[PDB]
């Protein structure tokens, strides 16, 4: 009993549904924080002042070897947004790879609504690529660093199990999927974009122009909740949606995640809910594959009555497979073959009677035009 990329295995965790945090610990002597595990932007930032959600913070007046960049930088998200200060110093992941970096952070000074109380984390790690860094793409990404500066091979891999996780660094570790791993190509190293070809409602195509699906992009992102879909293709989900779980109705607002629905402990009738399949572009031309969640994924549990919300929502800039897609996958940040794969979470939560899937391969011609440009 062992494993190559053992020590990294469930060194995610995740206090509620509020995101997926691993330690890292920045300066000399060592100050280490929970910090949110984030595909979504690029910059590794951290609360670096007395906040009243956070239990602590970076202090770069005891950090010997903390250099001043004598910069300030802002950042807003879909979420939330943060003011700083740049610097550099020596960062490490105590679960993470054996070595030590000294990378570029932003010490978090000010922020509105980002930090969230309750969530046990204490910053961020922006994993995309430069091209979205702020204040620009000359400021480094942390893992652009580690790959530099170190031998780390320029890939890691994202195991985040609903109700932390692991995040191999490097590399891949087997037991943390079932059956084979389905990639599909990086469309352009901004954010990890990606390309859907056609979407599917317990086994019914959408049977809407892959255009919408993608309209204006289609990207993962480890930091957002849910699944964020475009105003078109939202409308017709929802529809669909609604139609296939006919056997009992809800009000508007809870498609709309306004209105939370409660069951009894443990009786959530998940069988009435259907499961949603997006097709992706597989690596050879005109072949796809599909990743297939349930409703485990995308309806989320909220603190004898178990509550949940309806976790897929609308977006004006394009799709965001958050956390709902994720959680049903073992999700392989190929950075080196400009690939992301999937595969079937060893740990994603489901039922008797369904599962997770990624099945292939597929037929699907003209994936090309599905593009944004
Ligand atoms: C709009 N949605 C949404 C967006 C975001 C959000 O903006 N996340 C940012 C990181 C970010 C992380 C933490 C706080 C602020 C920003 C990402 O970099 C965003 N990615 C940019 C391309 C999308 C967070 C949550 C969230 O609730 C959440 C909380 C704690 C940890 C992880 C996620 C929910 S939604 C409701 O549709 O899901």
Redesign the pocket.
Known sequence: RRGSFVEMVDNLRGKSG??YYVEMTVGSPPQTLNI?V?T??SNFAVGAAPHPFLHRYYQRQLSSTYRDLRKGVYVP????AWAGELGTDLVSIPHGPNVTVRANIAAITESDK?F?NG?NWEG?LGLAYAEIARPDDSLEPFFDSLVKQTHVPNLFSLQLCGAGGSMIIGGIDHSLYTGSLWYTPIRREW?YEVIIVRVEINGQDLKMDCKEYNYDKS?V?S????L?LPKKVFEAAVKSIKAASSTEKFPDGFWLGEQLVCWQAGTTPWNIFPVISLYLMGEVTNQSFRITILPQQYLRPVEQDDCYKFAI?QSS?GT?M??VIMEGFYVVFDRARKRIGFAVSACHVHDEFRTAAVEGPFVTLDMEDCGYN
């Open positions: 509020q995101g949110l984030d979504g932007s998200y879909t979420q939330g980002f969230i969530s961020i954010y990207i992102d930091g957002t909740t849910n964020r929502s800039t965001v958050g956390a």
